Amino acid sequence: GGLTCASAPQGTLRILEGPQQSLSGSPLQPIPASPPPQIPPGLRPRFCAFG
Amino acid sequence: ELIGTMEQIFMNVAIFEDEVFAGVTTHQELFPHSLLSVIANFIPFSDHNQSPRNMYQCQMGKQ
Numbered sequence: 001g002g003l004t005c006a007s008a009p010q011g012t013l014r015i016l017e018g019p020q021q022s023l024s025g026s027p028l029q030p031i032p033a034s035p036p037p038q039i040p041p042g043l044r045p046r047f048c049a050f051g
Numbered sequence: 052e053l054i055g056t057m058e059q060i061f062m063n064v065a066i067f068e069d070e071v072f073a074g075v076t077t078h079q080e081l082f083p084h085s086l087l088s089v090i091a092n093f094i095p096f097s098d099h100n101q102s103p104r105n106m107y108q109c110q111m112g113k114q
Contacts, residue, residue, distance in 0.1 A: 026071060028079050033068045 052078065 056064070062076045072077055084092055090109050091097065097105045105113045 024073065026073070026076075028065075028068050028071050034083055 054078070 054064075062077045063075050063081055065076045066078070066080050066083050070076070077099065087097070088109070090112060093112065094100075094105055094108050097108075101107075
């Protein structure tokens with residue numbers, strides 16, 4: 001009436017919960033790159049010679 | 052994301068865009084001058100001076 005060893009298991013199942021990968025879009029930056037410093041339009045000379 | 056000193060050795064981090072690739076370049080840096088300190092970011096055009104001179108500027112801006 002006691003507990004005895006039974007037949008060895010024939011296989012093992014290991015369960016884990018996993019989600020999946022999306023598409024590669026690689027959206028690097030809101031406003032991207034190093035935007036260049038640049039000329040103010042027209043500007044004009046702010047200096048003249050004497051005479 | 053936020054990465055650490057040991058987690059940064061196993062990942063590619065572009066600096067400028069157009070340096071980002073498809074398989075390579077897992078991450079990307081926020082600004083190109085992220086590498087420099089707060090004081091080293093106050094030196095103008097540090098890119099065109101030799102380096103031992105940016106080390107003296109950092110020590111001279113504090114005197």
